[PDB]
Amino acid sequence: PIVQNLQGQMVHQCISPRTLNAWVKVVEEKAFSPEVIPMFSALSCGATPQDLNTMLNTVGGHQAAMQMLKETINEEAAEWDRLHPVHAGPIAPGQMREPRGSDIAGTTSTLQEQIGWMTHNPPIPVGEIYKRWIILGLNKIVRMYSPTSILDIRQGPKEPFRDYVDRFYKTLRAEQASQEVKNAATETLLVQNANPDCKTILKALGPGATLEEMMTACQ
Amino acid sequence: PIVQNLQGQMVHQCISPRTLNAWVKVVEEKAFSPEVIPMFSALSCGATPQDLNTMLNTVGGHQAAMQMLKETINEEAAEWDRLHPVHAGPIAPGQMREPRGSDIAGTTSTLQEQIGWMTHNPPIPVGEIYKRWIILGLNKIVRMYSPTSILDIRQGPKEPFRDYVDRFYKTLRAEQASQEVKNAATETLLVQNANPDCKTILKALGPGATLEEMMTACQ
Amino acid sequence: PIVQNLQGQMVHQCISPRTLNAWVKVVEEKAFSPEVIPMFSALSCGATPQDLNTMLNTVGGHQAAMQMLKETINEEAAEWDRLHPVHAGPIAPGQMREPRGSDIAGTTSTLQEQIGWMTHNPPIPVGEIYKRWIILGLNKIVRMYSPTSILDIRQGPKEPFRDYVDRFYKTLRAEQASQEVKNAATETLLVQNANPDCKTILKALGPGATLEEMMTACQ
Amino acid sequence: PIVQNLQGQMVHQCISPRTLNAWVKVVEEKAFSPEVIPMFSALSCGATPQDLNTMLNTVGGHQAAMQMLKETINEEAAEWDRLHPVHAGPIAPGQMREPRGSDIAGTTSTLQEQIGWMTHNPPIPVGEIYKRWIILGLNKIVRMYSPTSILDIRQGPKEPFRDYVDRFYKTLRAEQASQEVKNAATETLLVQNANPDCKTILKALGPGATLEEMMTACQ
Amino acid sequence: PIVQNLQGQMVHQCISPRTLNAWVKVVEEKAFSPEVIPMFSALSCGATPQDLNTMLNTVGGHQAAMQMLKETINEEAAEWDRLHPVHAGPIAPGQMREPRGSDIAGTTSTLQEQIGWMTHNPPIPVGEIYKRWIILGLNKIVRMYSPTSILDIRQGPKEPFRDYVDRFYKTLRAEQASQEVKNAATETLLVQNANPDCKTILKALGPGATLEEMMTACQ
Amino acid sequence: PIVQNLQGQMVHQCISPRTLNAWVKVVEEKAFSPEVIPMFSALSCGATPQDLNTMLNTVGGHQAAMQMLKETINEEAAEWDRLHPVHAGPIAPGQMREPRGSDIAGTTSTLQEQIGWMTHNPPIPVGEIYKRWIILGLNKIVRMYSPTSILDIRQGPKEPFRDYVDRFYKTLRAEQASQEVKNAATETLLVQNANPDCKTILKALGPGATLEEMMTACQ
Numbered sequence A, B, C, D, E, F: 001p002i003v004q005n006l007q008g009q010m011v012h013q014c015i016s017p018r019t020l021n022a023w024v025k026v027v028e029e030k031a032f033s034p035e036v037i038p039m040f041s042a043l044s045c046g047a048t049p050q051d052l053n054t055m056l057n058t059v060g061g062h063q064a065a066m067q068m069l070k071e072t073i074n075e076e077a078a079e080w081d082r083l084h085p086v087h088a089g090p091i092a093p094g095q096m097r098e099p100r101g102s103d104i105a106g107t108t109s110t111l112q113e114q115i116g117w118m119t120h121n122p123p124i125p126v127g128e129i130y131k132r133w134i135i136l137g138l139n140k141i142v143r144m145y146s147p148t149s150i151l152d153i154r155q156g157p158k159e160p161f162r163d164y165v166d167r168f169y170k171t172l173r174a175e176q177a178s179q180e181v182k183n184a185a186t187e188t189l190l191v192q193n194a195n196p197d198c199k200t201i202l203k204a205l206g207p208g209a210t211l212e213e214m215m216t217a218c219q
Ligand SMILES: CN(C(=O)[C@H](Cc1cc(F)cc(F)c1)NC(=O)Cc1c[nH]c2ccc(O)cc12)c1ccc2scnc2c1
Pocket: A053, A056, A057, A059, A063, A066, A067, A068, A069, A070, A071, A073, A074, A105, A106, A107, D169, D170, D172, D173, D176, D177, D182
């Protein structure tokens, strides 16, 4: 990654064994549960493209997912190239060249080039641009590997309401509900999918109840 | 987080793998036992809003609780906006803009903006403001998930007094008793809820006994 | 805590995850065995009052003990206030104010205030003052939770002398014997509580024997 | 390794116990799965030839592989020597000498020499050159130890498509398919090797389907 | 401990959780096996008297041993006082005072005093002096807890010679043989205590055989 | 060890708990497998003689080996003294004295002396000299504890060739074959010791086959 040192300057540091191990372990334990994405983001703080590729390459399993991620990256890189075509022909001696999509993804750029872009004034934040593409791909994979529709999350007759709500919002997270549903699912589907006894109580609360109020009512 | 370096200056540092792992593990092990809150507070020392969101987002389960926390945050952010309305229209070039509630919660602000607010002279401590909202929400969740009323903590006939007192004050902590009860429960309910033999002894101690004195008397 | 940096200056640093985890684990494993106190002391090196409260608050169980500790703190804080009354009325702008007992215990003071006191020339060492109160309380709890009188530590007929002496001095430590007994128990109770065969040998050694000499004699 | 310090200068640092342990453990756990290579690369960031030899020498098992790796190194070192012959006869006093292949591999050079080459302006990056030879050898070993032809990865009649695709691309990775196959295997062999029911569906998708589309179709 | 910082100056640093944990664990696992002493010495690098007391106080069991160690310390402190009596009467304002034995052992000195002695030019190395007393005491305890005489280490008829020699020198280490025996036991008791078959072979080697030669001969 | 700090200067640092633990664990797990030597070398980067003795002394078992190592050290120290006799009689005040063999081994020198030698311009690298003696001794022990002759490593009739080659080169490593055999054993004994079926195939490959080619042929 690129870090600031103790005297305020941006320099390259090796990825730590701790970081490497943390990432491998989170993939091993959590697969593509939604919470893997914020963990990736955090563990890739300051990452170069080379570092991001390192992280992805350390994943041993989940190769269907890793191929989908490559496809996503290739699409974003192609879009980059449409928006930001570079002049061809030899680079001015000693001067920074313009990154193409493949350079952002670290396939056709050196570490030295990546460092140069990321620490330029003003910077071309190739680490952050690539990380965005990766996260886009990861979110697609999370959605793919989500096993259950929100339509199929219904409170059992002997299921505590809190347990149901846990399942409901964990499923919405994976399914990657748009903000309206996340926000309002409370008013709609959460009540509809409750068991008959809790549904009766929730209906009687009337509109605008907080989740705290609902959970209290159905305790 | 924002830390001071070795030469006395405030700069941004990535959240460490150790910090990330510690938080996930404490939620995994302790759920919303009251002691999770001081651990959150400690692990989020110097945190930006982005860091706080990272921490919250790394939680995989407990999604009912995480939705209640969002609701709490939204309420505090709305109150912020009522107390501190911002001027609309384009920002003066190069100048710090005023944070709205959504900016404090990290949904509409960049890391660079957050750093700028937190390190301004004087600072707008958006990390600490957001952390307060989060802790407010966490305390509500602790109360919610507390399973037992203090009224139902009564000393068994074969239960050592110390074991009872442990249960009593652990329950009061979760229930989030006001200071009077925490302070005085000793004089009131703790004695009332003791078993007959210990109650007889405690009654005979008369008023103002310390907890040490009570525990000695009922050993 | 407040630490010196690499250039010799006293600044605030966040409590580390390692420190936090070490403390929780020592309480989990050792409860209020006497050796918990030196571990607390060591793990709270340089601690502010805020840090000390963090450490105490991270304890999930042992709430009878934690309430006794609060009582101890309240007594010491009240004594502080009797010895060091503060002038009331508004503080001189920009100037350090005088700490009350509640400020030392971190209930009515900010982190910024605590830092200011601890790093003043000359300092008001509020961390060390509070730590002393806490340790006083912890020692009371160690004594309380000590299960066995020294009077009841007697060498079994088939018990190796070393095993007995281990039990004896572990019990004296918890019971918190005054220096005379720690020093001289060797000459008195240790011999009296030995089994008949070892007692006969120890009696014949005559006065002033070292513990090494006693242990050799009864091997 | 050679690292930059806190003031921006390139100096030698000992290989850490953490790095050493991470490498041994990855070989112990993963043998020569393809993901071992990016882990080697990452753990050898900034490595001298001496460090690289340390890493390789810490491997206790897999001695057939380690002998193949030596053979690969010897071939690359011989090629180096053909491309970059050195002048014989005594070195100018005090001056940097030119590295031979054996010097790059760390068999005939000192640590001091390696440091001198790697930190020269301009550098002779002997660590990176040697690392390339090692990675070439490691890739040969990965291919060797790959147990299964891609021709033999066929979807079972009761095997979820995702599970099949996982096996397929994990095998292609080890077999070290050229870019065309990695890229296009999707259009060819992946469909051919699918079970009859999924094959029927995939055929009907027509050309140019993304892997995401295929996986959705065969869910 | 007192350490040098990054700019070459001697300052106080808190004892780390890692150091604390390492020491407790070595006592837990190894008791008073001889190898505990070098581990103590290493973990107490740069220690103040306060740090050394911390380390000793963190030991929960082995209280017979810890009381013997106190006795040893008291003897060394008394000898210190006989060799280095201090002038009584009030200290010159602002000036370093002379340490007594109790000050070296950390019972009557502050951390500030200890730091002052250890960093004086020239220093009064109270940490190293106390550590020597402790190590003297620890060595006595190692000898005490050594269960077996070297006279009783004899090679079994079916025992490999190497296994016997392992037992022999492990016992000599604990028994704390003087240099002559350590050096020459090879020529004497090691042969005498070998089984008849190996003894016959060793006798025929004649004088001055290395241990390597003996072990080869009896393989 | 002696390390460079963050400003480029050579100073003494305590051996870390991590280093100590890593070494003990590698001896516990691996005994005197050949791979222990590179691990020793790596963990003793920058070590003083005092540090090296610390490392060796922390080993609890394997005392036959540790006595052989002492013997090796004594021989090398005696040779040092024959090659580099020192002038007797009192040292010039304030001046560096010349190390004898016992000083290099850390038995008759202080830490301060060792630091002085190692950081002199030009240095007398007593750490590296002693480490060489230790490694010489360790290699002798590895050879000693190697249980099996290369003559006895023969491919089983149902043993995969790769498994055989693993055993073969692991045995050669321990036996510490000279370079010719390591290099050429491939052409000779490896084929001779193969099972009849693989031997037939290898014979037909003719001379100069790589190990990769052999392993492919016998798959
Ligand atoms: C520069 N770069 C890389 O080193 C990527 C990084 C990467 C990207 C990703 F999206 C998923 C990953 F698991 C690993 N790694 C690989 O190509 C290695 C590999 C993994 N599984 C594989 C399965 C089959 C196979 O024949 C190779 C691989 C790279 C980076 C981005 C893209 S987009 C298309 N190709 C690339 C290549």
